[PDB]
Enzyme design. Structure first.
Site, mmCIF file in Angstrom:
data_model
loop_
_atom_site.group_PDB
_atom_site.id
_atom_site.type_symbol
_atom_site.label_atom_id
_atom_site.label_comp_id
_atom_site.label_asym_id
_atom_site.label_seq_id
_atom_site.Cartn_x
_atom_site.Cartn_y
_atom_site.Cartn_z
ATOM 1 N N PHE A 15 0.858 -1.275 -0.118
ATOM 2 C CA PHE A 15 -0.022 0.098 -0.415
ATOM 3 C C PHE A 15 0.798 1.342 -0.060
ATOM 4 O O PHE A 15 0.378 2.370 -0.176
ATOM 5 C CB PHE A 15 -0.935 0.159 1.348
ATOM 6 N N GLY A 16 2.148 1.193 0.025
ATOM 7 C CA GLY A 16 3.230 2.143 0.168
ATOM 8 C C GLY A 16 2.985 3.274 -0.666
ATOM 9 O O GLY A 16 3.286 4.470 -0.251
ATOM 10 N N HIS A 17 2.862 2.917 -2.039
ATOM 11 C CA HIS A 17 2.997 3.956 -3.093
ATOM 12 C C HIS A 17 1.648 4.703 -2.720
ATOM 13 O O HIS A 17 1.601 5.922 -2.808
ATOM 14 C CB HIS A 17 3.059 3.239 -4.430
ATOM 15 N N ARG A 142 1.637 12.400 7.467
ATOM 16 C CA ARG A 142 0.239 12.920 7.618
ATOM 17 C C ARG A 142 0.124 13.762 8.931
ATOM 18 O O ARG A 142 1.022 14.036 9.602
ATOM 19 C CB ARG A 142 -0.861 11.709 7.964
ATOM 20 N N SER A 233 10.761 2.318 5.383
ATOM 21 C CA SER A 233 10.202 3.126 4.277
ATOM 22 C C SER A 233 9.593 4.225 5.168
ATOM 23 O O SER A 233 10.228 4.982 5.815
ATOM 24 C CB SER A 233 9.354 2.453 3.571
ATOM 25 N N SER A 234 8.419 4.530 4.741
ATOM 26 C CA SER A 234 7.583 5.756 5.079
ATOM 27 C C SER A 234 7.653 5.979 6.729
ATOM 28 O O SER A 234 7.601 7.145 7.028
ATOM 29 C CB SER A 234 6.050 5.602 4.654
ATOM 30 N N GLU A 238 8.376 9.405 9.736
ATOM 31 C CA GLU A 238 7.417 9.635 10.956
ATOM 32 C C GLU A 238 8.154 9.457 12.314
ATOM 33 O O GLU A 238 8.121 10.104 13.103
ATOM 34 C CB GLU A 238 6.270 8.516 10.743
#
Length: 281
Positions: A15-17, A142, A233-234, A238
Site C-alpha cells: 500500500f506504500g505508494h 500525515r 520506508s515511510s 514519521e
C-alpha cells in the site's frame, strides 16, 4: 492543476505508494489516479477518480493522458522505466514528477526522493532542467504526526512493532514471537493483513502483546512506546519527526539506501529478513 498519479497497490505490491501518493495529492485540487485492477488493491479507498487500466501497455497510459489533457503526471511505480518516461514525454509533452527511492535515473521534470538519506547531488547525471527534491525536507507525513510531535507521552509499551500496511513476509509475528514475554508490546497492522487471524491467535497465547488494527492514531502509539521496530520506508520519516528510538528492518532490497544511512547515524538496522528463508512466517 489537472494531475494524474500512475501508481499501483495490491496484496503483492503493498500500500506504500498509494498511501504516500495520497499525502502528496493534497497539494493539488484536480487529482486522478490510473491503476491496474489488481487483487487486494486500494482502488476503493482512493477518494479521487481512479481510471482502470485494461493493460500494462504504456500506450494505454499515453492515451489517457492525451484524452483527458492531464497537465502533470506523477509516477510512483517501479514498473515504469526511463524509456517509458521518455516516451510519455515525447508523445504527450506532459510534465513528469517521478518518485525515486534507490537513486536511479529518471526522465522527469521533478525528481522526488522523500527518504532522509537522499541528497540532490546523488542525481547528478541521472536526470535532465529537472528540479531535484531530496531528503527530509520533502517527507510525506500525515497531519496527526505533526500534532503528536508536540506531546510528551508517558511510556506504555517497551516495543511498538509496525511493518507497514500489509506485512507480506509476516515479520510482525516473527519479531513479537521472539521478544521476551515480560516486554510490553504493541503491534499495528491493517485488517488486510493476510496473516491477521494467526497474529490474533498468537496474541491470545500470551499476556504481553496488544494488537491495534487499522488504528487511527498510530503517532500516539509510537510516542508512547520506548523502542520502535519499523520497516525502513515511510515509517522512518514519521519516527524521525517524533524523535523516537527505533530499530529499522530493511524489508525489501529497495530500502537498502535508507537502512545504510540509518546505521551510519547510529540506529540499529536489520538486513536478515532479505534472506530467502525469511520470505514467509
Amino acid at each position: 492543476m489537472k494531475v494524474l498519479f500512475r501508481s499501483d497497490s495490491s496484496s503483492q505490491i503493498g500500500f506504500g505508494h498509494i498511501k504516500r501518493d495520497l499525502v502528496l495529492a493534497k497539494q493539488y485540487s484536480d487529482v486522478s489516479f490510473a491503476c491496474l485492477p489488481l487483487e487486494g488493491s486500494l482502488i476503493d479507498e482512493i477518494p479521487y477518480p481512479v481510471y482502470e487500466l485494461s493493460s500494462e501497455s504504456i500506450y494505454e497510459l499515453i492515451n489517457l493522458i492525451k484524452e483527458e489533457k492531464f497537465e502533470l503526471l506523477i509516477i510512483d511505480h517501479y514498473g515504469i522505466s526511463v524509456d517509458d518516461e521518455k516516451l510519455i514525454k515525447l508523445e504527450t509533452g506532459v510534465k513528469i514528477l517521478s518518485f525515486d527511492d534507490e537513486i536511479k535515473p529518471h526522465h522527469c521534470d521533478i525528481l522526488l526522493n522523500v527518504n532522509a538519506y537522499a541528497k540532490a547531488s546523488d542525481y547528478e547525471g541521472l536526470v535532465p532542467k529537472c528540479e531535484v527534491r531530496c531528503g527530509f525536507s520533502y517527507a510525506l507525513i500525515r497531519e496527526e504526526f505533526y500534532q503528536e510531535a508536540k506531546e510528551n507521552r508517558k511510556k506504555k509499551y517497551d516495543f511498538f512493532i509496525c511493518m507497514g500496511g500489509t506485512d507480506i513476509k509476516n515479520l510482525s509475528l516473527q519479531i513479537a514471537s521472539e521478544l521476551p514475554k515480560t516486554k510490553i508490546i504493541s503491534i499495528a497492522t491493517s485488517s488486510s493483513n493476510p496473516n491477521l487471524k494467526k497474529l490474533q491467535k498468537f496474541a491470545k497465547l500470551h499476556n504481553n502483546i496488544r494488537l491495534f488494527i487499522d488504528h487511527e492514531n498510530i503517532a500516539k502509539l509510537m510516542n508512547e512506546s520506548n523502542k520502535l521496530i519499523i520497516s525502513a520506508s515511510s515509517l522512518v520519516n514519521e519516527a524521525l519527526l517524533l524523535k523516537a528510538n527505533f530499530k529499522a528492518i530493511c524489508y525489501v532490497k529497495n530500502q537498502e539506501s535508507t537502512a545504510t544511512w540509518l546505521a551510519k547515524k547510529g540506529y540499529e538496522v536489520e538486513y536478515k529478513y532479505l534472506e530467502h528463508h525469511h520470505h514467509h512466517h
